[PDB]
């Protein structure tokens, strides 16, 4: 198992093809929008380019993403929301926000009232915001070998 | 992770030359012209490949499916040139006992100077090595 | 056979673009011109690579040997742009505690707007991000 | 170990580069001469092209080689000899002829007398012959990745 991890990784890293203007990171391609849209229109905007409003699965991915948005100083949408409006945050892929990720919300975040059910990268952490607000968005999709 | 590694490998290394078909790690070339068995052998060597040597039942099945869309007869890397009823692949290996099942009904033959194998949609036939047939070349798929 | 597999892998996948140097699975590009830190970052992205992020002690050593033949100063994918004394690689990862040893004596600094790291023959120095330096790009070696 | 063997093999098979006119087989390149020379001159002739008078290491290699020489109906030298003239056959790489390979000699082969201390592929098996005789020869060298 010692080598398997290394080799497996070294191998998966060879398939790193991403579209033009997209950035590669650990097996996936990321797209930083050039315009702004509300949450819902961002969810569909990503599907149009065969991607998905970014669903964060590891702490390393979260670090990469936060660095990207802060580099351009833009507030960006992520595929996380609580549309049932009851403290249950879920990723657009259907998975639930794991306990170990609550650490990423900025102090005071999230909030039960105010009709703010969409997560965004805001400053050095996460903020919940009105889904109708206009923000940049980040798309994510598997990297290809060709 | 062992299996996941193969998936990565299987995913990355599946590059085949233009007009060759990929299948389980290899590239297969169905010719666009016919030649006798010996010239088919050199034809494959010229493209750094080998007149197809069948190693698995799946490959045999795949080649049958490919062949079925045209109903061709193709030379394969199998022969009994010394006429001993001793069939060998061009890589020197003997036709194992478990692969003898692939001969079509009535094949092979210990008579008629039919010392070469041809691949059809239902199995193998033995035939005169000088006959003109299409051929099938085989070589490993690449990674880039 | 595990190790023997790597040897095969290590042997086959060591292809690097023209003018890049291969080292333990990766390709390194020592620039032929200078730019500021941000333009160096985009310069690497333009060639499907990344301003070098150092992951092992061996790589650090290798880059020092490479650098020593010219005594250059090169931008590396490390910065503290928010000026927190919090250094991060361009892939988002924090400078681990065990890699802090590579800073040259007297580096880094919590003053002087020197928020970018430059690679020298003896270690790292922090410097104004607008200064013009050569740069080092990194990306995986290929198999063909 | 089950997969390791498959994968390892599938991988080694990707480095199959051989010179012009040389034939590839299981990780190595083989050259069938176009002229004839005695044994000793064949040993050096192969070194000139960065190879070695073929040293057979497996039964599968032996089958491949025997098929090659019989295809052209040529008697060919191999890197096997008993120059000490005392029933001790050794490969040019210094390794000894293993017990399980004695099966390849043609009936009656080898012989203690007659000054025949060099092995050749003769017919469907091996023959020992006078080293000064002219035969075709087969060179062998590792296959490259480039
Ligand atoms: Na909320
Ligand atoms: Na909020
Ligand atoms: Na026959
Ligand atoms: Na027949
Ligand atoms: Na500083
Ligand atoms: Na400094
Ligand atoms: Na003898
Ligand atoms: Na003899």
From Swiss-Prot, chains B, C:
Task: Tell me which residues are glycosylated.
Answer: 109
Q: Tissue expression, per UniProt?
A: Predominantly highly expressed in liver sinusoidal endothelial cells and in lymph node. Found in placental endothelium but not in macrophages. Expressed in type II alveolar cells and lung endothelial cells.
**Residues where Ca(2+) binds:** 107, 109, 111, 114, 125-126
Tell me the ranges holding the sequence repeats.
Answer: 1-16
Q: List the disulfide bonds.
A: 13-143, 16-27, 44-137, 116-129
List each copy of the C-type lectin domain by range: 22-138
What is said about its interaction partners and assembly? Answer: Homotetramer. (Microbial infection) Interacts with ebola virus glycoprotein.
- Misc: In vitro, is a receptor for HIV-1 and transmits HIV-1 to permissive T-cells.
Q: Describe its function.
A: Probable pathogen-recognition receptor involved in peripheral immune surveillance in liver. May mediate the endocytosis of pathogens which are subsequently degraded in lysosomal compartments. Is a receptor for ICAM3, probably by binding to mannose-like carbohydrates. (Microbial infection) Acts as an attachment receptor for Ebolavirus.
The UniProt comment on domains reads: The tandem repeat domain, also called neck domain, mediates oligomerization.
What is the protein's name according to its record? C-type lectin domain family 4 member M
Q: Which gene holds the coding sequence for this protein?
A: CLEC4M
Q: Which residues of the full protein are shown?
A: 253 to 396 of 399
């Amino acid at each position: 198992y010692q080598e398997l991890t290394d080799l497996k990784t070294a191998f998966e890293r060879l398939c790193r093809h991403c579209p033009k203007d997209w950035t590669f990171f650990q097996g996936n391609c990321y797209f930083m929008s050039n315009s702004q849209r509300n949450w819902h229109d961002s969810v569909t905007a990503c599907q149009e380019v065969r991607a998905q409003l970014v669903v964060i699965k590891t702490a390393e991915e979260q670090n990469f993403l936060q660095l990207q948005t802060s580099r351009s100083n833009r507030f960006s949408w992520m595929g996380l929301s609580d549309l049932n409006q009851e403290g249950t945050w879920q990723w657009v892929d259907g998975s639930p926000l794991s306990p170990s990720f609550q650490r990423y919300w900025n102090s005071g975040e999230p909030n039960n009232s105010g009709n703010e059910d969409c997560a965004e990268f805001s400053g050095s952490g996460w903020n919940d915001n009105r889904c109708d607000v206009d923000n940049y968005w980040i798309c994510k999709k598997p990297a290809a070998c060709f």
